[PDB]
Design a protein around this nucleic acid. Structure first.
Ligand code: ZN
Length: 462
RNA sequence: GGUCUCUCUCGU
RNA sequence: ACGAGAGAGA
Protein backbone atom coordinates (compact mmCIF):
# COMPACT_ATOMS: atom_id res chain seq x y z
CA UNK A 1 0.00 0.00 0.00
CA UNK A 2 1.04 3.57 -0.70
CA UNK A 3 -0.42 7.00 -0.12
CA UNK A 4 -1.01 8.67 -3.48
CA UNK A 5 -1.95 12.15 -2.29
CA UNK A 6 -2.97 14.24 0.70
CA UNK A 7 -5.39 17.18 0.28
CA UNK A 8 -7.04 19.62 2.69
CA UNK A 9 -10.72 18.84 3.44
CA UNK A 10 -11.43 22.30 2.03
CA UNK A 11 -10.22 21.16 -1.40
CA UNK A 12 -12.16 17.84 -1.34
CA UNK A 13 -15.34 18.95 0.43
CA UNK A 14 -15.05 16.32 3.14
CA UNK A 15 -16.24 16.89 6.71
CA UNK A 16 -13.61 16.91 9.46
CA UNK A 17 -13.31 13.60 11.31
CA UNK A 18 -11.96 14.13 14.83
CA UNK A 19 -11.56 11.31 17.31
CA UNK A 20 -10.76 11.22 21.03
CA UNK A 21 -7.18 12.06 22.14
CA UNK A 22 -7.00 10.76 25.73
CA UNK A 23 -7.06 7.09 26.75
CA UNK A 24 -9.94 5.33 28.54
CA UNK A 25 -7.28 3.03 30.03
CA UNK A 26 -6.38 3.53 33.68
CA UNK A 27 -4.19 1.43 35.95
CA UNK A 28 -6.29 -1.25 37.65
CA UNK A 29 -6.22 -2.55 41.21
CA UNK A 30 -3.81 -5.24 39.90
CA UNK A 31 -1.35 -2.85 38.20
CA UNK A 32 1.26 -3.37 40.93
CA UNK A 33 0.35 -7.00 41.69
CA UNK A 34 1.55 -8.24 38.28
CA UNK A 35 4.53 -7.26 36.12
CA UNK A 36 4.08 -5.83 32.57
CA UNK A 37 5.69 -3.59 29.90
CA UNK A 38 2.72 -2.14 28.03
CA UNK A 39 1.08 1.25 28.37
CA UNK A 40 -1.82 2.97 26.62
CA UNK A 41 -0.96 3.70 23.00
CA UNK A 42 -0.11 7.25 21.96
CA UNK A 43 -3.27 9.07 20.97
CA UNK A 44 -1.89 12.62 20.62
CA UNK A 45 0.81 14.52 18.65
CA UNK A 46 2.48 15.77 21.80
CA UNK A 47 2.38 12.79 24.09
CA UNK A 48 5.36 13.37 26.41
CA UNK A 49 6.32 9.75 25.79
CA UNK A 50 6.93 10.31 22.07
CA UNK A 51 10.45 10.16 20.60
CA UNK A 52 9.51 10.70 16.92
CA UNK A 53 6.98 12.76 14.95
CA UNK A 54 3.62 11.11 15.58
CA UNK A 55 1.86 11.30 12.22
CA UNK A 56 4.98 10.18 10.39
CA UNK A 57 5.20 6.94 12.35
CA UNK A 58 1.45 6.44 12.07
CA UNK A 59 1.50 6.31 8.30
CA UNK A 60 4.97 4.79 7.88
CA UNK A 61 3.13 1.44 7.59
CA UNK A 62 2.29 2.28 3.98
CA UNK A 63 5.60 0.96 2.72
CA UNK A 64 4.85 1.26 -1.00
CA UNK A 65 3.89 -1.14 -3.78
CA UNK A 66 5.88 -3.47 -5.96
CA UNK A 67 3.70 -5.61 -8.25
CA UNK A 68 0.37 -4.42 -9.72
CA UNK A 69 -0.29 -7.24 -12.15
CA UNK A 70 -0.29 -10.95 -11.21
CA UNK A 71 2.61 -12.94 -12.65
CA UNK A 72 2.20 -16.65 -13.51
CA UNK A 73 2.96 -17.82 -9.98
CA UNK A 74 0.25 -15.64 -8.45
CA UNK A 75 -2.18 -16.67 -11.24
CA UNK A 76 -1.61 -20.37 -10.65
CA UNK A 77 -1.84 -19.81 -6.86
CA UNK A 78 -5.13 -17.95 -7.12
CA UNK A 79 -6.47 -20.82 -9.23
CA UNK A 80 -5.48 -23.64 -6.92
CA UNK A 81 -7.23 -21.89 -4.03
CA UNK A 82 -10.28 -21.16 -6.16
CA UNK A 83 -10.78 -24.83 -7.13
CA UNK A 84 -10.33 -25.83 -3.52
CA UNK A 85 -13.19 -23.51 -2.51
CA UNK A 86 -15.54 -24.93 -5.13
CA UNK A 87 -16.37 -27.96 -2.96
CA UNK A 88 -17.87 -25.52 -0.41
CA UNK A 89 -20.58 -24.54 -2.92
CA UNK A 90 -20.66 -20.87 -1.95
CA UNK A 91 -23.87 -19.03 -2.82
CA UNK A 92 -22.69 -16.29 -5.18
CA UNK A 93 -26.16 -14.73 -5.32
CA UNK A 94 -26.78 -11.41 -3.61
CA UNK A 95 -28.03 -11.69 -0.03
CA UNK A 96 -31.18 -9.66 0.83
CA UNK A 97 -30.71 -6.27 2.53
CA UNK A 98 -32.71 -7.47 5.54
CA UNK A 99 -30.39 -10.44 6.16
CA UNK A 100 -27.27 -8.33 5.46
CA UNK A 101 -28.32 -5.67 7.98
CA UNK A 102 -29.94 -7.79 10.67
CA UNK A 103 -28.19 -11.16 10.47
CA UNK A 104 -28.56 -14.86 9.78
CA UNK A 105 -27.65 -18.05 11.60
CA UNK A 106 -24.06 -17.65 10.38
CA UNK A 107 -23.56 -13.88 10.24
CA UNK A 108 -23.95 -11.50 13.16
CA UNK A 109 -26.08 -8.42 12.52
CA UNK A 110 -24.41 -5.08 11.87
CA UNK A 111 -23.00 -3.88 15.22
CA UNK A 112 -25.34 -1.15 16.43
CA UNK A 113 -23.14 -0.07 19.34
CA UNK A 114 -20.55 1.03 16.89
CA UNK A 115 -20.21 4.18 14.72
CA UNK A 116 -22.15 4.58 11.47
CA UNK A 117 -19.21 6.30 9.81
CA UNK A 118 -18.96 8.93 7.08
CA UNK A 119 -20.92 11.08 6.88
CA UNK A 120 -23.31 10.14 9.70
CA UNK A 121 -20.67 10.36 12.45
CA UNK A 122 -20.28 14.08 11.68
CA UNK A 123 -24.03 14.70 11.29
CA UNK A 124 -24.67 13.08 14.66
CA UNK A 125 -26.57 10.22 13.04
CA UNK A 126 -26.05 6.83 14.68
CA UNK A 127 -26.88 3.37 13.37
CA UNK A 128 -29.81 3.01 15.76
CA UNK A 129 -31.46 6.01 14.07
CA UNK A 130 -31.54 3.96 10.84
CA UNK A 131 -31.59 0.29 11.82
CA UNK A 132 -33.84 -1.52 14.28
CA UNK A 133 -33.30 -5.14 15.35
CA UNK A 134 -36.92 -5.53 16.47
CA UNK A 135 -38.51 -3.93 13.37
CA UNK A 136 -36.07 -5.41 10.83
CA UNK A 137 -36.87 -2.19 9.05
CA UNK A 138 -34.91 -1.99 5.83
CA UNK A 139 -36.74 1.09 4.48
CA UNK A 140 -34.69 3.91 6.07
CA UNK A 141 -31.50 2.10 5.03
CA UNK A 142 -32.58 1.84 1.39
CA UNK A 143 -33.16 5.60 1.53
CA UNK A 144 -29.74 6.58 2.88
CA UNK A 145 -28.17 4.21 0.33
CA UNK A 146 -29.64 6.50 -2.29
CA UNK A 147 -28.94 9.73 -0.44
CA UNK A 148 -25.20 9.32 0.11
CA UNK A 149 -24.47 6.39 -2.21
CA UNK A 150 -21.53 4.00 -2.04
CA UNK A 151 -17.74 4.32 -1.92
CA UNK A 152 -17.78 6.83 0.95
CA UNK A 153 -14.42 7.69 2.57
CA UNK A 154 -13.04 5.73 5.49
CA UNK A 155 -12.85 7.76 8.72
CA UNK A 156 -9.45 7.32 10.33
CA UNK A 157 -9.05 6.97 14.09
CA UNK A 158 -6.18 5.91 16.33
CA UNK A 159 -6.92 2.66 18.24
CA UNK A 160 -7.06 2.95 22.04
CA UNK A 161 -5.19 -0.08 23.40
CA UNK A 162 -2.09 -1.41 25.13
CA UNK A 163 1.18 -1.37 23.19
CA UNK A 164 4.73 -2.33 24.17
CA UNK A 165 7.00 0.45 25.37
CA UNK A 166 9.11 0.28 22.23
CA UNK A 167 5.96 0.95 20.26
CA UNK A 168 4.97 3.94 22.39
CA UNK A 169 8.30 5.74 22.05
CA UNK A 170 8.25 5.12 18.29
CA UNK A 171 4.72 6.45 17.75
CA UNK A 172 3.67 3.04 16.37
CA UNK A 173 -0.02 3.14 17.24
CA UNK A 174 -2.56 1.32 15.09
CA UNK A 175 -5.19 3.01 12.97
CA UNK A 176 -8.63 1.75 12.29
CA UNK A 177 -10.57 2.73 9.20
CA UNK A 178 -14.20 3.25 10.08
CA UNK A 179 -16.42 2.02 7.30
CA UNK A 180 -19.44 3.85 6.05
CA UNK A 181 -22.55 1.91 7.00
CA UNK A 182 -23.45 2.16 3.31
CA UNK A 183 -20.43 0.17 2.16
CA UNK A 184 -20.79 -2.30 5.04
CA UNK A 185 -24.38 -2.91 3.93
CA UNK A 186 -23.41 -3.24 0.27
CA UNK A 187 -20.38 -5.44 0.94
CA UNK A 188 -22.59 -7.63 3.14
CA UNK A 189 -25.29 -7.88 0.47
CA UNK A 190 -22.66 -8.93 -2.08
CA UNK A 191 -20.50 -11.31 -0.05
CA UNK A 192 -22.77 -12.18 2.91
CA UNK A 193 -23.19 -15.76 1.70
CA UNK A 194 -19.41 -16.17 1.40
CA UNK A 195 -19.07 -14.86 4.98
CA UNK A 196 -21.62 -17.45 6.14
CA UNK A 197 -19.75 -20.28 4.42
CA UNK A 198 -16.38 -19.24 5.88
CA UNK A 199 -17.82 -18.69 9.39
CA UNK A 200 -19.33 -22.19 9.38
CA UNK A 201 -16.24 -23.93 7.96
CA UNK A 202 -13.04 -22.93 9.71
CA UNK A 203 -10.46 -25.48 8.61
CA UNK A 204 -8.18 -26.36 5.71
CA UNK A 205 -10.80 -26.12 2.95
CA UNK A 206 -11.60 -22.44 3.44
CA UNK A 207 -8.03 -22.17 4.69
CA UNK A 208 -9.46 -19.88 7.31
CA UNK A 209 -9.73 -20.04 11.11
CA UNK A 210 -12.44 -17.38 11.26
CA UNK A 211 -15.35 -18.85 13.17
CA UNK A 212 -13.17 -21.26 15.10
CA UNK A 213 -13.25 -21.84 18.82
CA UNK A 214 -9.68 -22.40 20.12
CA UNK A 215 -10.98 -24.72 22.97
CA UNK A 216 -12.09 -27.32 20.42
CA UNK A 217 -10.28 -26.17 17.26
CA UNK A 218 -6.78 -26.71 18.68
CA UNK A 219 -7.41 -30.48 18.84
CA UNK A 220 -8.15 -30.62 15.10
CA UNK A 221 -5.14 -28.65 13.85
CA UNK A 222 -2.40 -31.26 14.31
CA UNK A 223 -4.69 -33.54 12.26
CA UNK A 224 -5.58 -30.79 9.74
CA UNK A 225 -1.96 -29.69 9.30
CA UNK A 226 -0.02 -33.01 9.11
CA UNK A 227 3.68 -33.24 8.36
CA UNK A 228 6.20 -30.47 8.92
CA UNK A 229 4.97 -27.11 10.17
CA UNK A 230 6.17 -23.84 8.84
CA UNK A 231 5.09 -20.40 9.92
CA UNK A 232 6.31 -16.85 10.13
CA UNK A 233 5.11 -13.33 10.92
CA UNK A 234 4.40 -10.37 8.67
CA UNK A 235 5.32 -6.84 9.61
CA UNK A 236 2.47 -4.60 8.60
CA UNK A 237 0.61 -7.14 6.50
CA UNK A 238 -2.57 -5.16 5.74
CA UNK A 239 -0.82 -1.93 4.78
CA UNK A 240 1.96 -3.77 2.92
CA UNK A 241 -0.38 -5.44 0.39
CA UNK A 242 0.38 -4.43 -3.20
CA UNK A 243 -2.52 -4.10 -5.67
CA UNK A 244 -1.47 -7.35 -7.33
CA UNK A 245 -3.01 -9.22 -4.41
CA UNK A 246 -6.36 -7.53 -5.02
CA UNK A 247 -6.10 -8.55 -8.67
CA UNK A 248 -5.36 -12.04 -7.43
CA UNK A 249 -8.44 -11.91 -5.23
CA UNK A 250 -10.57 -10.87 -8.22
CA UNK A 251 -9.35 -14.02 -10.00
CA UNK A 252 -10.55 -16.15 -7.06
CA UNK A 253 -14.00 -14.57 -6.82
CA UNK A 254 -14.48 -14.70 -10.59
CA UNK A 255 -13.57 -18.45 -10.74
CA UNK A 256 -15.97 -19.51 -8.03
CA UNK A 257 -18.75 -17.84 -9.93
CA UNK A 258 -19.08 -14.25 -8.89
CA UNK A 259 -20.65 -11.79 -11.31
CA UNK A 260 -18.48 -9.16 -12.93
CA UNK A 261 -20.65 -6.61 -11.10
CA UNK A 262 -19.67 -8.21 -7.76
CA UNK A 263 -15.97 -8.77 -8.61
CA UNK A 264 -15.80 -5.03 -9.39
CA UNK A 265 -16.18 -4.25 -5.66
CA UNK A 266 -12.60 -5.36 -4.93
CA UNK A 267 -11.03 -2.34 -6.64
CA UNK A 268 -13.28 -0.47 -4.22
CA UNK A 269 -11.09 -1.60 -1.33
CA UNK A 270 -7.78 -1.68 -3.19
CA UNK A 271 -8.20 2.00 -4.01
CA UNK A 272 -9.61 3.90 -1.03
CA UNK A 273 -9.99 7.39 0.35
CA UNK A 274 -9.59 8.32 3.99
CA UNK A 275 -10.34 11.29 6.22
CA UNK A 276 -7.90 11.85 9.11
CA UNK A 277 -8.73 15.01 11.08
CA UNK A 278 -8.88 17.81 8.52
CA UNK A 279 -7.25 16.09 5.58
CA UNK A 280 -8.26 13.67 2.88
CA UNK A 281 -5.87 11.10 1.53
CA UNK A 282 -5.88 8.34 -1.05
CA UNK A 283 -4.38 4.90 -0.50
CA UNK A 284 -3.64 2.48 -3.33
CA UNK A 285 -3.13 -1.10 -2.23
CA UNK A 286 -3.35 -2.15 1.42
CA UNK A 287 -6.43 -3.74 2.99
CA UNK A 288 -8.48 -1.07 4.84
CA UNK A 289 -8.61 -2.44 8.42
CA UNK A 290 -12.23 -1.57 9.12
CA UNK A 291 -14.31 -2.50 6.13
CA UNK A 292 -16.74 -5.35 5.89
CA UNK A 293 -14.92 -8.57 4.95
CA UNK A 294 -11.55 -7.52 6.41
CA UNK A 295 -10.89 -10.86 8.18
CA UNK A 296 -12.07 -13.15 5.42
CA UNK A 297 -10.54 -11.21 2.53
CA UNK A 298 -7.20 -10.99 4.37
CA UNK A 299 -7.45 -14.73 5.01
CA UNK A 300 -8.24 -15.49 1.39
CA UNK A 301 -5.30 -13.36 0.24
CA UNK A 302 -2.93 -15.15 2.61
CA UNK A 303 -4.09 -18.40 1.04
CA UNK A 304 -3.09 -16.99 -2.35
CA UNK A 305 0.16 -15.58 -0.98
CA UNK A 306 1.50 -18.78 0.65
CA UNK A 307 0.84 -20.78 -2.51
CA UNK A 308 2.54 -18.29 -4.83
CA UNK A 309 5.57 -18.06 -2.52
CA UNK A 310 5.93 -21.86 -2.44
CA UNK A 311 5.93 -22.42 -6.18
CA UNK A 312 8.14 -19.41 -6.99
CA UNK A 313 10.73 -20.30 -4.35
CA UNK A 314 11.00 -24.04 -4.79
CA UNK A 315 11.10 -26.66 -7.51
CA UNK A 316 8.51 -29.40 -7.68
CA UNK A 317 6.11 -28.17 -5.06
CA UNK A 318 2.86 -30.08 -4.99
CA UNK A 319 0.21 -27.60 -3.81
CA UNK A 320 -2.25 -30.43 -3.08
CA UNK A 321 0.10 -31.44 -0.29
CA UNK A 322 -0.11 -28.01 1.30
CA UNK A 323 -2.41 -27.62 4.27
CA UNK A 324 -2.80 -24.20 5.79
CA UNK A 325 -5.06 -22.14 8.01
CA UNK A 326 -5.12 -18.35 8.04
CA UNK A 327 -6.71 -15.76 10.29
CA UNK A 328 -5.90 -12.56 8.50
CA UNK A 329 -2.11 -12.44 8.44
CA UNK A 330 -1.73 -15.10 11.12
CA UNK A 331 -0.84 -18.46 9.54
CA UNK A 332 -0.13 -22.03 10.38
CA UNK A 333 0.79 -24.20 7.40
CA UNK A 334 2.16 -27.68 6.81
CA UNK A 335 3.75 -29.67 3.96
CA UNK A 336 5.11 -33.26 3.56
CA UNK A 337 8.69 -31.94 3.59
CA UNK A 338 10.09 -29.04 5.63
CA UNK A 339 9.85 -25.58 4.06
CA UNK A 340 12.66 -23.06 4.51
CA UNK A 341 11.05 -19.74 5.38
CA UNK A 342 14.31 -17.84 5.02
CA UNK A 343 13.80 -18.47 1.32
CA UNK A 344 10.06 -17.68 1.33
CA UNK A 345 10.87 -14.29 2.91
CA UNK A 346 13.41 -13.48 0.19
CA UNK A 347 10.66 -14.14 -2.32
CA UNK A 348 8.29 -12.24 -0.05
CA UNK A 349 10.37 -9.08 -0.48
CA UNK A 350 9.99 -9.30 -4.28
CA UNK A 351 6.24 -9.09 -3.60
CA UNK A 352 6.64 -6.25 -1.06
CA UNK A 353 5.93 -8.54 1.87
CA UNK A 354 8.03 -8.26 5.02
CA UNK A 355 8.24 -11.64 6.72
CA UNK A 356 10.08 -12.41 9.96
CA UNK A 357 10.65 -15.58 12.02
CA UNK A 358 7.75 -17.03 14.04
CA UNK A 359 9.53 -17.27 17.41
CA UNK A 360 10.10 -13.44 17.26
CA UNK A 361 13.84 -14.33 16.92
CA UNK A 362 16.11 -13.11 14.10
CA UNK A 363 16.66 -16.65 12.73
CA UNK A 364 14.08 -18.77 10.93
CA UNK A 365 14.45 -21.74 13.26
CA UNK A 366 12.32 -24.90 13.24
CA UNK A 367 8.61 -24.51 13.97
CA UNK A 368 7.02 -27.51 15.75
CA UNK A 369 3.88 -28.13 17.86
CA UNK A 370 5.95 -27.58 21.00
CA UNK A 371 6.69 -23.98 19.97
CA UNK A 372 4.09 -23.00 17.36
CA UNK A 373 1.62 -20.29 18.22
CA UNK A 374 -1.54 -19.20 16.45
CA UNK A 375 -3.92 -16.44 17.61
CA UNK A 376 -1.30 -15.86 20.36
CA UNK A 377 -1.88 -19.32 21.90
CA UNK A 378 0.39 -22.32 21.91
CA UNK A 379 -0.43 -26.01 21.64
CA UNK A 380 -0.13 -28.15 24.78
CA UNK A 381 -1.21 -31.76 24.92
CA UNK A 382 -3.42 -32.67 27.88
CA UNK A 383 -1.43 -34.83 30.30
CA UNK A 384 -4.36 -37.21 30.72
CA UNK A 385 -5.79 -37.36 27.15
CA UNK A 386 -2.92 -36.49 24.74
CA UNK A 387 -5.08 -36.26 21.59
CA UNK A 388 -6.91 -33.30 23.23
CA UNK A 389 -4.87 -30.09 22.90
CA UNK A 390 -4.89 -27.07 25.22
CA UNK A 391 -4.66 -23.66 23.57
CA UNK A 392 -2.15 -21.97 25.83
CA UNK A 393 -2.39 -18.24 26.13
CA UNK A 394 0.93 -17.13 27.75
CA UNK A 395 0.50 -15.80 31.29
CA UNK A 396 2.68 -12.88 30.15
CA UNK A 397 -0.12 -11.55 27.92
CA UNK A 398 -2.73 -12.26 30.56
CA UNK A 399 -0.77 -10.30 33.10
CA UNK A 400 -0.65 -7.43 30.59
CA UNK A 401 -4.42 -7.29 30.23
CA UNK A 402 -5.26 -7.45 33.91
CA UNK A 403 -3.09 -4.46 34.87
CA UNK A 404 -5.40 -1.92 33.18
CA UNK A 405 -9.09 -1.18 32.69
CA UNK A 406 -11.46 1.02 30.71
CA UNK A 407 -14.09 0.77 33.43
CA UNK A 408 -13.48 -0.83 36.84
CA UNK A 409 -17.25 -1.35 37.00
CA UNK A 410 -16.58 -4.56 35.12
CA UNK A 411 -13.56 -5.95 37.00
CA UNK A 412 -15.49 -9.14 37.80
CA UNK A 413 -16.22 -10.02 34.14
CA UNK A 414 -12.70 -9.06 33.03
CA UNK A 415 -10.91 -11.22 35.58
CA UNK A 416 -13.25 -14.17 34.88
CA UNK A 417 -12.51 -13.83 31.18
CA UNK A 418 -8.78 -13.89 31.86
CA UNK A 419 -9.21 -17.04 34.00
CA UNK A 420 -10.92 -18.81 31.11
CA UNK A 421 -7.79 -18.08 29.11
CA UNK A 422 -5.31 -18.84 31.85
CA UNK A 423 -6.24 -22.28 33.14
CA UNK A 424 -4.98 -24.08 30.04
CA UNK A 425 -1.43 -23.35 31.23
CA UNK A 426 -1.96 -25.86 34.05
CA UNK A 427 -3.13 -26.23 37.65
CA UNK A 428 0.13 -24.98 39.15
CA UNK A 429 0.26 -21.87 36.93
CA UNK A 430 -3.44 -21.06 37.39
CA UNK A 431 -3.41 -21.14 41.20
CA UNK A 432 -0.34 -18.86 41.19
CA UNK A 433 -2.54 -16.55 39.12
CA UNK A 434 -5.56 -16.81 41.38
CA UNK A 435 -3.71 -16.38 44.66
CA UNK A 436 -1.95 -13.29 43.22
CA UNK A 437 -5.37 -11.93 42.40
CA UNK A 438 -6.46 -12.73 46.02
CA UNK A 439 -3.36 -10.92 47.39
CA UNK A 440 -5.31 -7.70 47.22
CA UNK A 441 -8.64 -6.44 48.63
CA UNK A 442 -10.73 -6.21 45.41
CA UNK A 443 -9.45 -9.71 44.56
CA UNK A 444 -11.07 -11.32 47.61
CA UNK A 445 -14.41 -9.94 46.48
CA UNK A 446 -14.41 -11.48 42.99
CA UNK A 447 -15.97 -14.78 41.99
CA UNK A 448 -13.19 -16.89 40.42
CA UNK A 449 -13.77 -20.15 38.48
CA UNK A 450 -12.58 -23.39 40.08
CA UNK A 451 -9.81 -25.12 38.09
CA UNK A 452 -11.37 -28.59 38.16
CA UNK A 453 -14.68 -27.20 36.98
CA UNK A 454 -13.00 -25.42 34.06
CA UNK A 455 -11.27 -28.71 33.16
CA UNK A 456 -14.46 -30.71 33.68
CA UNK A 457 -16.44 -28.36 31.42
CA UNK A 458 -13.63 -28.47 28.86
CA UNK A 459 -13.61 -32.28 28.68
CA UNK A 460 -17.36 -32.34 28.07
CA UNK A 461 -16.96 -30.17 24.94
CA UNK A 462 -15.83 -33.47 23.49
C1' G B 1 -13.48 5.71 18.57
C1' G B 2 -14.00 0.10 12.38
C1' U B 3 -14.67 -4.81 10.58
C1' C B 4 -15.35 -9.67 12.27
C1' U B 5 -14.82 -14.12 15.20
C1' C B 6 -14.88 -16.68 19.80
C1' U B 7 -15.86 -17.01 24.81
C1' C B 8 -17.93 -15.43 29.31
C1' U B 9 -21.50 -12.44 32.32
C1' C B 10 -26.21 -10.06 33.21
C1' G B 11 -31.14 -9.55 32.45
C1' U B 12 -36.68 -11.03 30.10
C1' A C 1 -35.09 -17.79 22.29
C1' C C 2 -34.34 -12.48 22.66
C1' G C 3 -32.25 -8.08 24.73
C1' A C 4 -27.81 -5.59 27.53
C1' G C 5 -22.55 -5.73 29.04
C1' A C 6 -17.49 -7.44 28.95
C1' G C 7 -12.81 -9.77 27.61
C1' A C 8 -9.71 -11.77 24.24
C1' G C 9 -7.92 -12.67 19.09
C1' A C 10 -7.28 -11.26 13.88
ZN1 ZN D 1 -7.68 7.89 -4.95
Amino acid sequence: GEIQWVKPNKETGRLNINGPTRTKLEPSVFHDVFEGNKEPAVLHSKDPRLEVDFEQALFSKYVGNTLYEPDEYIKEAALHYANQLKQLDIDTSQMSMEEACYGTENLEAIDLHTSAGYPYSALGIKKRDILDSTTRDVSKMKFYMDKYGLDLPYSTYVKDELRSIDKIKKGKSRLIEASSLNDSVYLRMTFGHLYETFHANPGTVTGSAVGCNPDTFWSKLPILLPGSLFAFDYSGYDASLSPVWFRALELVLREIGYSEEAVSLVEGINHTHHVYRNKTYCVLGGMPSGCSGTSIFNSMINNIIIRALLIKTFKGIDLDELNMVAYGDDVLASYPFPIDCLELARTGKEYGLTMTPADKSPCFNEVNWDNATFLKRGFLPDEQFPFLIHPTMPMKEIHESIRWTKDARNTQDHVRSLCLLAWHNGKQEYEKFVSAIRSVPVGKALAIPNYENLRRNWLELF
